[PDB]
Design a protein around this ligand. Structure first.
Ligand SMILES: Nc1ncnc2c1ncn2[C@@H]1O[C@H](CSCC[C@H](N)C(=O)O)[C@@H](O)[C@H]1O
Length: 254
């Protein structure tokens, strides 16, 4: 499948994208990173990671009420793009209500802990955040605690060679609804490790998903899943102008 306006229909920033002028007038700690371009427009220098951090932290504060602390030394996520994936998963696990508790896994949560944070806020989803990087693990366990989401999000430091399988030994939950992953920059080799772990977990997770960075990666993975005889295999492409990612998910369910 593929979504109109190249991004998910339920995305906040599809109809109402970020307004630099507005955010500068509200958050004077963001006003410092914004500069007036030639066209008179209020613009952020996307090269400066401190500027980009200021935007991402402000959009979380402004639109989700999330106050996060993230280091420059680590990846700065781009709020609207990550949000498409949150909505795609919503669609996959057939969102719809108050007594229907849905639980997922985030393979590589990052310093931000962006997916579990959005996910637990927007929908109240229980998450199992995994991390190999200590710095990332420290900041994520911190952002979760400071937004009092300690109850829904369970951040866990994990060994290097370990993925999905190994992580589901603490805690012991029978059925997980989804698992999202944003592979770090071979890419194909990573999702292949996810595919394999999914072959042994099968119906224990309703949906296994992966946000890809390269379109070339879709063709072999689509073929791998097909060779392994995976019943449902779904894919889409998201967008944020210059940026473009390819989310792919697969289920063993009829
Ligand atoms: N085998 C593995 N298991 C768990 N986490 C891993 C891992 N390999 C890498 N990671 C971690 O996963 C992260 C990938 S970056 C994805 C971060 C986040 N979801 C975002 O979009 O902001 C890194 O912080 C890295 O330390």
């Amino acid at each position: 499948m593929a979504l109109s306006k190249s991004m998910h229909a339920r995305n906040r920033y599809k109809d109402k994208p970020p307004d630099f002028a507005y955010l500068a007038s509200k958050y004077p700690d963001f006003k410092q990173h914004v500069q007036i371009n030639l066209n008179g427009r209020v613009s952020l220098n996307f090269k400066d990671p401190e500027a980009v951090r200021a935007l991402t932290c402000t959009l979380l504060r402004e639109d989700f009420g999330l106050s996060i602390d993230i280091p420059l030394e680590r990846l700065i996520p781009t709020v609207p793009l990550r949000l498409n994936y949150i909505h795609w998963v919503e669609d996959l696990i057939g969102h719809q209500d108050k007594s229907t508790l849905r639980r997922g896994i985030d393979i590589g949560t990052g310093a931000s802990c962006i997916y579990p944070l959005l996910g637990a806020t927007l929908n109240g989803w229980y998450f199992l955040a995994t991390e190999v990087d200590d710095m990332c693990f420290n900041y994520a366990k911190k952002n979760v605690e400071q937004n009092n989401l300690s109850d829904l999000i369970k951040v866990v430091k994990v060994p290097q060679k370990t993925l999905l399988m190994d992580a589901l030994k603490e805690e012991s939950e029978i059925i997980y609804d989804f698992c999202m992953c944003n592979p770090p920059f071979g890419e194909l080799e990573f999702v292949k490790r996810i595919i394999h772990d999914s072959l042994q977990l099968k119906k224990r997770l309703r949906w296994y998903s992966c946000m890809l960075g390269k379109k070339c990666s879709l063709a072999p993975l689509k073929e791998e899943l097909r060779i392994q005889g995976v019943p449902k295999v779904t894919y889409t492409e998201f967008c944020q102008g210059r940026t473009m990612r390819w989310a792919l998910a697969w289920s063993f369910y009829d």
